[PDB]
Design a protein around this ligand. Structure first.
Ligand SMILES: O=P(O)(O)O[C@H]1[C@H](OP(=O)(O)O)[C@@H](OP(=O)(O)O)[C@H](OP(=O)(O)O)[C@@H](OP(=O)(O)O)[C@H]1OP(=O)(O)O
Ligand SMILES: Nc1nc2c(ncn2[C@@H]2O[C@H](COP(=O)(O)OP(=O)(O)OP(=O)(O)O)[C@@H](O)[C@H]2O)c(=O)[nH]1
Ligand SMILES: [Mg+2]
Ligand SMILES: [Zn+2]
Lengths: 173, 54, 48, 852, 144, 456, 145
């Protein structure tokens, strides 16, 4: 667009006087400048691409996979071939018990594994509260969502509003 | 139109496609004021001249 | 041209027509050269 | 002290020792028109006295203009003091207190703050532009503040390098400039002993771009140091002014030999200056070294490689040397201040020279009673603390010494505007560094720390426990009137206090600033123009309060006048129902308001001289002329209070019992006024009758002041009231072709062109016009945009003229956001001001009577 | 939702009076029984400075503008404007300009978004029936 | 001579006499010679002809003015002084002065004081006005009121007026406007039972450079930290005067025992070989605290069977388990985990506990809702001290005297404060203007954010 | 004599060379003797106009630097009361660029333009057969005495 700009700048000074319209104007230094200043910027891009060539939203899923990966590493191989599915059910059960404001204490669970599940539930809790409030500002603002996002959001906000309401009742007591 | 744009200027002071050309809606210098449309080009003592023009 | 000594500049670095769109666009010009003057000024000002 | 000061040609012990000897001090205001070379001249003096402070090659160091808005605008905005030690032609070093004042006419008030603490004036005149608007206005204000006036015709290189005049014709240009300044001084002064001519040394010629500065004596001393046997003062007596040189008899004749010989100025001064500038700018490579060898100048090989303007500045720095002609001129023709103490005390002290303290202030002695006087407040760039700047007229301020600051409302009977403040520190204020001193003797200028709290504009610092009969110096009578009125609120009201704090601070910084709050709670700043208020608003938002501030549209303050006498003789009784006052209001005679305002008359006169004036000048009877009570809202205001009460109907001692309260109510009534609460102008208030209560607890004070205001208001309103417009006098400096463009720009804004006259010796014209100040908002922007920058206008307040409408006209409908036509502009101007003021929607003529 | 000359004009006496009225009402209610919050309230002063009296009641946004007070005009019949006349003398003394609350237009918009979002696997007749039902409810409640 | 016989002294109404604000002329903005009109409360440049007080007196028929600096009353336009002892409460509301007998008996004041309107109050138990979002600072300023020695310092202006300032020093405005506010809050003869802190807060806004605004509320711990540090900075005369009243009242000396843990991802041979490196040994970086920061253990993420409330609960001694020489706190910065132990060496006379409620997680700021179960009339802090120290410290028993409580979300929160009135034993919840009488058993049920304790 | 050397870094020219190079480049240069031509058209003027979301007529137009004050969202204070405002001329874009602190509420990131520089009254010499110092007829005559 800029070179066309310079053409309009140059031609309308060039084509004054006895010079009329026509293909005879060549004052090429302006456009040639512009294309060299483009070459300045994309020289290291194409050089980095040739050096690479001529060589030699879902935080709950990532967080659950990361804590499952962290739990598994410190398990022995003779015990993790039975135990791993069960600790995923323990993760999901602690998260279901957090979402329900009910006590989750497994007595047979060892307290470092229990502390890591507690940690996972706190990280997912903070993400879950934040994504419920963020998706609610999205929905309430008028941003375009589908049915399962609203349904999911309404379930998250119902559990959050009842956590706040149970805290309100216990503050009254 | 220009009296309309003058009182509009008052009334608002207080109250995919590759397009290779600039639009005429991108334009400025659509003035109402005759001191700013016809803007008395420099007579450089009648001896200096604008660049490029013949 | 007000100098008599100077440092040599690249031919890229010398815009022959920068002080042309930095002037006011002359009288009687069509709309496309006027918006071209204003957009050359726009990228001049964004550069500076 | 011992602070870290820059390297200078003198040393600061010698500056502090020249401070004591007040015969070797020159308190000088460098004043002129906008961009006439004053700041670059101070730059040249600083480069002379400071070897490490050097101007850049392509961009002039200003070295005053130390504000950010000054560096960005390029216009000097505040006066910067510079205290240097400059050597004379004889080699004698004098202490120079130089006030670099803004030449823009909107900042004329700042010049007044420099004119008060100065004993002399160097009026800077562009040699190309000649005498301009602010040069005439500062001639007037300099000979009216009783200052010695000298002239520096700066920018003589524009006669050489721009106009390319012949040397005879540029001599004619400089002679026309000197003649124009002489005509202006003979206009504004009955005395003709202050004739300005370069033969006298009153006129200096300069080019502060290229560091040329010579009087005739300092150019003659270049001959005297080049050729030995010549006595340069007798030569300087022959150099200017239709004196030709006969080189066969070697004698200077008034008769021209050969009829093609040149004057002594053209032959001996202007043609060498032209040949220096022409050999530098035209023939540097070919023939500059042989002419430089002829002038005794040798430049290094690195120095001849310079571009043509730094090489010109260098060649003329080596030829002319120091600026000893400026020091010649300001030492011979600007007082001592020992000599200049007596006109300064006679003019600016309220007790006058005849007081017991006026005598000791005329002696100017450092071992006297302390009588410092500060006119400027200089903010430090943190914005918090101000420093009061002014001159010590007697005694010695000391750092750490408690002191008695008297504000402008301090009289000897109203001693409450004083305050005992401890002086924190003292600075000898050069522009970009301050020399911290332990004491400052009399005659010297000083920045004082710690006295900034009890003062707004102008202080008299005295000492406590003595000087009990110490009066204030007069407040700064300004060159113009702060007229342009902007309303100012914070964007967030919670930071109103910061803005109020900042409002106080701009009230300290700008001497003719008026910050008030109107009855609607609207904060109002009065200024002299749109550049002035743009800088005030910049300082308000950036320097002092760091908050965001909404500005209103700029409006003007109006005046109020009458055009005929009052229909019925108006009256007002007090709330006691005793003390009826009966006034009429009639318009003053033509030119009388100009006589009261410009101090052609005073109520401080006796009754005999005042009555003699009003009899011999305006056809008043001596019955009426001996009956003048007061002079408008101040002691010099455009209204008159007369009593035409016959002594048959009224007891005259019982009337003089309440003369003070009737005068106070009249002054307050003419200060506010009943149309739009803005000053009454050009109205004679005749007290026709006055019942007065017999016992003093029934008259006086709370009864008769508001009653006198009510009868002033009703007498005003029954006379046919008109609003008055401030009119700006606009001097446009356009090219010859842009004159019809200036006419076209002025025709859209109710401006009447007074004149379009060619600047003689320049290709430009001056269009002098009269725009209304309500129509001047963006006028200079309209003019410089329409003329592509070629025309340039300066607009200053000239007079008040009656708005073409009638303000008490309920027949006029005003749609709110439209430009009204002329024949009901006053009706628009009255009620919107009334809305701004917040008063009632309309003022009826019967609002201040007793019948309704 | 009203134009700037049609809103409450925030003059100092009227703003102080609105806040004063609100403070007087707020002191009468103990903060433990119920609160009355300024941020969810609206206090419109009609005075010599504000010619319009404004209130949102029942989803309607009403602006009463007296005939004596910034009309100066012959009016034809406009729809949302209610010619308020005096009961005894039958003189049109004010006009009530009606509008729909922004919360009510937002409720209708969110109702259509609930129709569309839960449309999904439903019949076109049921989507258009929900549109008809929301449109009749809006249009018969908010008529003028 | 017409002093003591002024007619216009009935025209004064004290219902409009608000002396809490900037003493500037309401027309000319000038602080020089400001006079309050006692008929309308508005300030006008004071005294003389053509001034604003004079022109106001003849404009409004408001004929009695008080010099706001000189404390002398004046009838205008005919300017004479007014000498009447019945006007003394106007000057005492404008400029409250406190004698040493009045300061020593200031905490022995059981009888209520009456304002000019029929509103009883106790001095110091006085509401601070709420400008937009202000209750953090009202709560902290009401906490530093009811601290007796800091109060008694700021009730005499002579305690701090003559101390030296830098020339362009704005920071002393905190000291003098805090003293003005303290004298207005402990004024026993006020005209209203509440004091606007607005000038004190404009000093806060200017001195913190738009940290701690009035339109936007900050945290009380941040404001108390900055405000005690800024009072201590500004009460030092052109230097760090090492002992101000803020140091003499609130500052103690703790002994932090930082111990660098080696690195967790190492083998055991290298992990116990790094012990002799002495970079991984204990230090002693003994310092001074204005306030002790008490860290609550986090909200337990699940309810339990007991105290069937969802509200968690810690004793005071369990979060004062920090600051004994046994309990080690993990510190975690980049590349380095330390084990800081704390040890109180100098216990202040008035000890501030800033209980840390608001912590930011990965996504938002969460408030710890944990209720500290503290006593209010006895905490023996003797066993949080070294035995090198407990022979010096004769009195270590502290009573609670102020309890700033944050209520609500970290976003839409409010601040109230339970102050103990001395002389009575009564506790008052001041939420900014309302003063409830709170019970001593109900202080320990609220979310204690800031606490001030008195060493007896 | 005329350049640095073979690196071609510094040139130093004789003023006849610079004069004839200036004459050969006459068509590319506008013969303005000032920067008064660029009043409200220089860089500062355009930085100001970009900062105020205003477009100088011959000049560029940008996105708003700050979010604009909608003048139908402000709610008729005593300050912006349009019944108090005397309208004489429309306050143009140019006046808010020329005096950005007088005519703008919230001038942020705004640049004070250079004011007047004094009018360079340079008389171009049409005739080289004329003396270099010559009373040109563009110069207004000085009437003697
Ligand atoms: O401005 P553009 O859209 O890029 O088109 C231009 C334009 O043609 P139009 O006027 O029809 O738009 C020029 O004509 P003028 O501006 O002078 O009126 C013409 O230049 P000439 O007519 O003087 O030859 C030029 O042609 P070119 O750039 O090849 O010289 C041509 O560009 P296009 O080749 O894209 O049509
Ligand atoms: N041709 C020529 N130009 C000069 C000379 N002296 C100063 N100038 C230029 O004229 C302009 C005047 O600026 P200043 O001298 O700094 O301003 P001033 O005269 O003090 O006036 P204020 O702007 O009001 O302060 C500057 O840009 C200088 O570059 C001179 O002697 N000859
Ligand atoms: Mg200057
Ligand atoms: Zn009053």
């Amino acid at each position: 667009r800029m070179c066309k700009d310079l053409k309009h700048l140059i031609y309308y000074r060039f084509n004054t006087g006895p010079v009329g319209k026509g293909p005879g104007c060549g004052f090429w230094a302006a456009g040639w400048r512009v294309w060299l200043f483009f070459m300045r910027g994309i020289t290291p891009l194409l050089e980095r691409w040739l050096g690479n060539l001529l060589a030699r939203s879902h935080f709950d899923l990532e967080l659950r996979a990361a804590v499952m990966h962290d739990i598994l590493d410190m398990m022995p191989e003779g015990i993790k071939q039975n135990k791993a599915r069960t600790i995923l059910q323990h993760l999901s059960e602690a998260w279901r018990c957090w979402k329900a404001n009910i006590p989750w204490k497994v007595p047979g669970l060892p307290t470092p594994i229990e502390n890591m599940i507690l940690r996972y539930v706190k990280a997912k809790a903070d993400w879950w509260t934040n994504t419920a409030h963020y998706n609610r500002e999205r929905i309430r603002r008028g941003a375009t969502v589908d049915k399962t996002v609203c349904k999911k959001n309404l379930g998250r906000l119902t559990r959050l509003y009842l956590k706040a309401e149970q805290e309100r009742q216990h503050n009254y007591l | 139109k220009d009296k309309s744009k003058e009182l509009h200027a008052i009334k608002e002071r207080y109250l995919r496609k590759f397009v290779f050309e600039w639009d005429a809606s991108e334009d400025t210098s659509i003035d109402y004021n005759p001191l700013y449309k016809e803007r008395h080009q420099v007579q450089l003592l009648g001896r200096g001249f604008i660049a490029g023009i013949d | 041209f007000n100098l008599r000594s100077g440092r040599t500049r690249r031919a890229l670095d010398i815009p022959l027509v920068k002080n042309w769109y930095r002037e006011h666009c002359p009288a009687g010009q069509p709309v496309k050269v006027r918006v071209s003057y204003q957009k050359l000024l726009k990228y001049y000002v964004l550069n500076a | 002290m011992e602070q870290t000061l820059p390297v200078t040609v003198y040393e600061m012990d010698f500056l502090a020792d020249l401070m004591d000897n007040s015969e070797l001090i020159r308190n000088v205001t460098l004043c002129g028109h906008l961009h006439h070379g004053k700041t670059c001249f101070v730059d040249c003096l600083i480069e002379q006295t400071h070897p490490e402070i050097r101007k850049r090659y392509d961009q002039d160091l200003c070295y005053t203009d130390i504000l950010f808005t000054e560096q960005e605008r390029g216009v000097g905005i505040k006066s910067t003091p510079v205290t240097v030690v400059l050597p004379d032609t004889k080699g004698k070093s004098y202490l120079f207190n130089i006030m670099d004042t803004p030449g823009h006419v909107n900042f004329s008030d700042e010049v007044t703050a420099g004119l008060r603490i100065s004993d002399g004036v160097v009026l800077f005149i562009d040699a190309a532009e000649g005498v301009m608007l602010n040069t005439e206005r500062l001639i007037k204000h300099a000979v009216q503040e009783r200052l010695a006036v000298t002239v520096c015709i700066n920018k003589i290189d524009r006669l050489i390098l721009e106009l390319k005049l012949p040397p005879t014709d540029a001599y004619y240009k400089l002679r026309h400039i000197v003649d124009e300044v002489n005509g202006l001084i003979s206009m504004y002064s009955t005395d003709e002993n202050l004739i300005l001519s370069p033969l006298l040394g009153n006129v200096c010629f300069s080019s502060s771009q290229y560091s040329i500065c010579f009087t005739l004596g300092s150019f003659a001393k270049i001959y005297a140091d080049t050729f030995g046997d010549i006595n340069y003062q007798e030569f300087a007596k022959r150099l200017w002014g239709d004196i030709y040189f006969n080189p066969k008899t070697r004698k200077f004749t008034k008769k021209a030999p050969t009829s093609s010989s040149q004057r002594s100025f053209v032959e001996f001064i202007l043609e060498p200056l032209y040949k220096i500038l022409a050999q530098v700018v035209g023939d540097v490579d070919t023939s500059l070294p042989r002419t430089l060898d002829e002038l005794g100048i040798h430049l290094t090989k690195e120095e001849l490689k310079l571009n043509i303007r730094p090489l010109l500045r260098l060649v003329c720095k080596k030829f002319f040397g120091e600026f000893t002609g400026f020091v010649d001129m300001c030492v011979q023709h600007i007082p001592s201040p020992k000599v200049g103490a007596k006109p300064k005390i006679e003019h600016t002290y309220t007790g006058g020279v005849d007081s017991d303290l006026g005598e000791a202030m005329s002696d100017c002695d450092p071992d006297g009673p302390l009588m410092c006087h500060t006119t400027k407040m200089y903010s430090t760039d943190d914005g918090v603390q101000f420093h009061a700047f002014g001159r010590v007229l007697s005694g010695t301020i000391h750092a750490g010494q408690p002191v008695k600051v008297l504000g402008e409302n301090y009289t000897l009977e109203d001693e409450e505007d004083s305050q005992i403040c401890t002086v924190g520190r003292l600075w000898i204020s050069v522009a970009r560094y301050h020399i911290e001193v332990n004491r400052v003797p009399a005659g010297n200028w000083v920045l004082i720390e710690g006295v900034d709290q009890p003062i707004v504009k102008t202080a008299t610092i005295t000492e406590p426990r003595g000087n009990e009969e110490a009066q204030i110096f007069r407040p700064l009578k300004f060159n113009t009137t702060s007229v342009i009125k902007i309303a100012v609120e914070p964007v967030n009201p919670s930071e109103l206090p910061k803005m109020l704090d900042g409002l106080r601070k701009v009230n300290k910084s700008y001497p003719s600033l008026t910050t008030k709050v109107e009855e609607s709670g609207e904060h109002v700043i009065l200024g002299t123009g749109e550049l002035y208020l743009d800088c005030v608003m910049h300082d308000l938002r950036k320097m002092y309060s760091e908050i965001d501030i909404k500005v209103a549209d700029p409006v003007v303050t109006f005046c109020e006048t009458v055009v005929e006498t009052s229909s019925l003789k108006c009256f007002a009784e007090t709330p006691n129902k005793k003390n009826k006052i009966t006034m009429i209001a009639e318009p003053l005679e033509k030119g009388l308001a100009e006589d009261i305002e410009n101090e052609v008359v005073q109520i401080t006169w006796n009754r005999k001289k005042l009555g003699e004036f009003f009899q011999t000048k305006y056809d008043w009877d001596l019955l009426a002329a001996r009956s003048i009570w007061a002079f408008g809202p101040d002691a010099t205001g455009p209204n008159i209070l007369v009593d035409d009460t016959l002594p048959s109907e009224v007891d005259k001692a019982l009337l003089g019992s309440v003369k003070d309260s009737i005068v106070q109510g009249f002054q307050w009534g003419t200060r506010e006024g009943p149309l739009c609460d803005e000053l009454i102008r050009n109205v004679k208030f005749k007290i026709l009758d006055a019942v007065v209560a017999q016992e003093p607890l029934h008259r006086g004070g709370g009864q008769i002041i508001p009653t006198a205001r009510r009868v002033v208001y009703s007498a005003f309103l029954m006379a046919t009231p008109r609003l008055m417009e401030p009119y700006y006098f606009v001097e446009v400096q356009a090219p010859a072709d842009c004159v019809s463009a200036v006419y076209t720009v002025l025709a859209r804004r109710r401006g009447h062109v007074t004149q379009d006259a060619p600047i003689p010796g320049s290709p430009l014209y001056t269009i002098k016009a009269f725009i209304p100040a309500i129509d001047s908002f963006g006028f200079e922007t309209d003019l410089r945009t329409h003329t592509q920058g070629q025309a340039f206008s300066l607009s200053v307040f000239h007079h008040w003229q009656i708005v073409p409408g009638d303000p008490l006209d309920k027949s006029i409908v005003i749609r709110p956001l439209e430009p009204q036509p002329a024949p009901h502009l006053a009706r628009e101007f009255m009620i919107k001001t009334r809305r701004r003021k917040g008063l009632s929607e309309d003022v009826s003529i019967s609002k201040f009577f007793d019948d309704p | 939702c009203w134009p700037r000359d049609a809103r409450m004009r925030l003059m100092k006496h009227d703003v102080n009076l609105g806040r004063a009225v609100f403070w007087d009402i707020k002191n009468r209610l103990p903060r433990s029984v119920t609160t009355v919050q300024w941020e969810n309230s609206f206090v419109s002063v009609y005075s010599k400075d504000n010619p319009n009296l404004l209130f949102n009641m029942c989803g309607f946004e009403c602006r009463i503008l007296p005939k004596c007070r910034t009309s100066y005009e012959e009016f034809t019949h406009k729809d949302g404007v209610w010619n308020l006349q005096n009961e005894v003398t039958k003189e049109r003394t004010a006009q009530c300009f009606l509008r729909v609350d922004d919360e009510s237009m937002q409720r209708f918009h969110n109702r259509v978004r609930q129709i569309l979002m839960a449309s999904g696997s439903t019949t076109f007749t049921k989507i258009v029936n929900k549109w008809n039902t929301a449109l009749i409810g809006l249009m018969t409640y908010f008529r003028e | 001579r017409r002093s003591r016989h002024c007619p216009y002294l009935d025209t004064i109404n004290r219902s409009v006499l608000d002396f809490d604000f900037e003493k500037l002329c309401s027309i000319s903005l000038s602080h020089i010679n400001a006079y309050a009109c006692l008929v309308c409360g508005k300030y006008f440049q004071g005294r003389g002809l053509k001034s604003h007080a004079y022109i106001h007196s003849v404009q409004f028929s408001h004929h009695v003015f008080l010099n706001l600096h000189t404390l002398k009353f004046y009838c205008l336009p005919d300017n004479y002084e007014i000498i009447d002892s019945s006007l003394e409460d106007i000057t005492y509301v404008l400029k409250p002065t406190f004698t040493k007998q009045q300061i020593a008996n200031l905490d022995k004041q059981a009888k209520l004081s009456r304002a000019y309107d029929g509103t009883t109050y106790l001095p110091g138990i006085v509401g601070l006005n709420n400008i937009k979002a202000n209750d953090y600072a009202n709560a902290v300023l009401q906490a530093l009121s009811n601290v007796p020695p800091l109060r008694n310092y700021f009730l005499e202006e002579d305690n701090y007026k003559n101390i030296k300032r830098p020339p362009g020093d704005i920071m002393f405005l905190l000291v003098q406007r805090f003293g003005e506010l303290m004298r207005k809050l402990w004024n026993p003869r006020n005209f209203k039972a509440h004091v606007s802190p607005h000038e004190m807060l404009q000093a806060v806004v200017l001195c913190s450079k738009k940290t701690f605004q009035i339109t936007k509320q900050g945290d009380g711990v941040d404001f108390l930290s900055w405000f005690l540090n800024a009072l201590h900075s500004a009460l030092g005369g052109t230097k760090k005067k090492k002992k101000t009243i803020v140091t003499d009242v609130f500052q103690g000396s703790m002994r932090i025992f930082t111990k660098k843990l080696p690195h967790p991802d190492l083998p055991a041979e290298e992990k116990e070989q790094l012990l002799h490196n002495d970079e991984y040994q204990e230090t002693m970086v003994e310092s001074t605290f204005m306030y002790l920061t008490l860290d609550l253990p986090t909200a337990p993420l699940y309810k339990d069977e007991k105290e069937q409330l969802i509200i968690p609960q810690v004793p005071l001694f369990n979060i004062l388990a920090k600051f004994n020489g046994i309990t080690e706190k993990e510190y975690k910065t980049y590349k380095e985990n330390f084990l800081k132990r704390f040890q109180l060496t100098k216990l202040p006379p008035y000890l501030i506990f800033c209980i840390k409620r608001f912590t930011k997680n990965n996504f938002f700021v969460e408030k710890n809702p944990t209720i500290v179960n503290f006593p209010i009339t006895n905490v023996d802090l003797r066993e949080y001290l070294s035995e090198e120290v407990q022979a010096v410290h004769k009195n270590t028993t502290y009573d609670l005297i102020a309890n700033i409580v944050h209520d609500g979300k970290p976003s839409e929160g409010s601040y109230r404060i339970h102050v103990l009135h001395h002389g009575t034993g009564k506790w008052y919840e001041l939420q900014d203007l309302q003063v409830t009488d709170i019970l001593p058993q109900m202080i320990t049920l609220s979310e204690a954010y800031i606490q001030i304790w008195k060493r007896r | 004599k005329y350049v640095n050397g073979s690196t071609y870094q510094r040139w130093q020219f004789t003023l006849p060379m610079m004069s004839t190079l200036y004459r050969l480049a006459n068509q590319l240069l506008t013969d303005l003797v000032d920067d008064n031509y660029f009043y409200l058209f220089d860089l500062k003027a355009f930085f100001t106009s970009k900062a105020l979301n205003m477009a100088i007529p011959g000049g560029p137009k940008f996105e708003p630097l700050v979010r604009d004050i909608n003048l139908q969202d402000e709610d008729w204070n005593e300050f912006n009361d349009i019944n108090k405002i005397i309208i004489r001329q429309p306050i143009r874009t140019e006046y808010k660029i020329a005096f950005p602190y007088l005519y703008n509420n919230l001038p942020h990131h705004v640049h004070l333009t250079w004011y007047h520089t004094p009018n360079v009254v340079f008389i171009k010499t049409e005739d080289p057969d004329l003396p270099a110092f010559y009373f040109d007829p563009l110069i207004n005559p000085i009437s003697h005495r």
